[PDB]
Structure formats: structure tokens, C-alpha cells
């Protein structure tokens, strides 16, 4: 059952992104939570009005309002007094993972602050493969960074995250989002770099079914690198769980092994 919040209490600021799919505005919020009279959430409008979308959207809004975990972007509800049709989410001051980790890279992020992001982005995927919940699209892009260098996970062919299965058999699986994570280990590592930006779309694929790996990150110490070969697996069966993954960087988290980049 999906919260529904009323147009009078939704005020659009300044719209913070877009896409196909509508436009993101950040929007200050009366009568949602009991201590704030107002405060700040991100608000997504949907640029369609008709049934076959209506239903896609109230499917979201209730699988959004299902999944609640420490770092899985909170959801608070919906508007559907008319077109469009409002999300609201809670807002994430810095943005995307992605933007996020350009513009703190050559002030830049130190090893312990990058090793934190990772977790968070383990804990949120432990979460979802708990329930069985395969996210299909798991990247930088789709994860958002709020105060205090909180990192949630959001937008619930990126052929450049996806294992050679995925790619050739359209099979995305549990071990499919696994991969997927150390392809975001190397985008954490890479401050926000591109898999493969040296290569096309095309030579991507071939790189990737032929069993190609990343190279190791220059600000990624071997024992990071050692946990995104073990994501990268070529059968789904012989790479790692993410409840793994997660405590192997929950234990560099706390610990950060003495790495100083420039070394190597």
C-alpha cells in the first residue's frame, strides 16, 4: 500500500535532472514527517498520463515503497492528483555516485572514503539479494551520495556492466548483479571512469565475452583488485556472493591495508 501525498504540500525549486521518463525536480515538503514542517525531498513527474504507463508507474511506487534498507534511496510516496504523476524521494545533496566521484577526483577522496562508498553499495545489493530482487542496472549513475558521504541505491543495455551471459543470453541473475558490482568497484576505484572507455560499444563486447579483465585501478590496492576478479568470474557459479563481497570490504572498510597509490 503506497502513501499519497497531496499537490498543496509538494513546492518544485530547481529541477536537478531528467530524462525520457519525465523530469527530477528538488521540491520543499509540508506535513511529511513529524519533527520538519518542511524540508527537502527530489521529486520525479512522469511525462505520460495514460493506463498502460498509470499501472508501470503504481508498480515502481509500490516495489519502492516495499524495499526499505539504510542504503537504498528512501521513498515516501506519490501524487496522483492529475498529470503528471509525482515520485517522492528523499534528497541526496551531491547527486549521482557518478558526478559524485568526478568531481572529488584528480579535494579528491582518500582510500578509506572510497572503501566506505563500496560498502555502502555491497550493503544495499546484500539487501536485495536477500529478497531475491535482481537490479538489472547496478552503477554509479544509478546510486545517489548524500550528506555526510551517505551512499544509496536508486533507477530500479549498460552491455559494459553486464557478465558474458547477460550480454549473449539476455540472463540476469542474482551472480548477473554481482558482476555488475565489481564493474562499480572499478568505477569507485577510477573516480567515476567509463569500463573500457578506450574501446567502442562493440569492441566492449568482444573484450568481455572473450574473458578480458579490467586493469587494476592506479589508487586500488591488489587486495580491492583481488575482490573485483573474484566478481568477474566467467561462470556465474565460481564468482563470489555479495554477502561475501560485502564483509571482505567491510573488513578493509574499518582496516584499510597501508596502500599509498603512488607506490602502486
Excluded at 36 to 57: C, G, P, T, Y
Excluded at 188 to 210: H, M, R, V
Aim: glycine share 8%.
Amino acid at each position: 500500500c503506497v502513501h499519497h501525498i497531496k499537490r498543496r504540500d509538494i513546492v518544485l525549486k530547481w529541477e536537478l535532472g531528467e530524462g525520457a521518463f519525465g523530469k527530477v525536480f528538488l521540491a520543499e515538503c509540508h506535513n511529511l514527517l513529524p519533527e520538519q514542517d518542511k524540508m527537502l525531498v527530489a521529486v520525479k513527474a512522469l511525462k505520460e498520463a495514460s493506463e498502460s504507463a498509470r499501472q508501470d508507474f503504481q508498480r515502481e511506487a509500490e516495489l519502492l515503497t516495499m524495499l526499505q534498507h539504510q542504503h537504498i534511496v528512501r521513498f515516501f510516496g506519490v501524487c496522483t492528483e492529475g498529470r503528471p504523476l509525482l515520485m517522492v524521494f528523499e534528497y541526496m545533496r551531491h547527486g549521482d555516485l557518478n558526478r559524485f566521484l568526478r568531481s572529488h577526483g584528480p579535494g579528491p577522496l582518500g582510500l578509506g572514503q572510497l572503501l566506505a562508498v563500496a560498502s555502502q553499495v555491497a550493503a544495499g545489493m546484500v539487501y536485495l539479494a536477500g529478497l531475491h530482487f535482481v537490479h538489472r542496472d547496478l552503477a554509479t549513475r544509478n546510486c545517489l551520495v548524500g550528506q555526510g558521504l551517505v551512499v544509496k541505491i536508486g533507477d530500479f543495455l549498460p552491455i559494459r556492466w553486464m557478465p558474458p551471459e547477460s550480454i549473449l543470453y539476455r540472463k540476469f541473475t542474482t551472480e548477473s548483479d554481482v558482476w555488475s558490482f565489481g564493474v562499480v568497484l572499478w568505477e569507485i576505484f577510477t573516480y567515476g571512469k567509463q569500463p573500457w572507455y578506450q574501446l567502442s560499444n562493440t569492441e566492449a563486447i568482444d573484450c568481455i565475452t572473450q574473458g578480458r579483465e579490467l586493469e587494476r585501478p592506479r589508487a586500488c590496492p591488489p587486495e580491492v583488485y583481488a575482490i573485483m576478479r573474484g566478481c568477474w568470474q566467467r561462470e556465474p557459479q565460481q564468482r563470489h556472493s555479495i554477502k561475501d563481497v560485502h564483509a571482505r570490504l567491510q573488513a578493509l572498510a574499518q582496516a584499510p591495508p597501508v596502500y599509498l597509490d603512488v607506490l602502486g
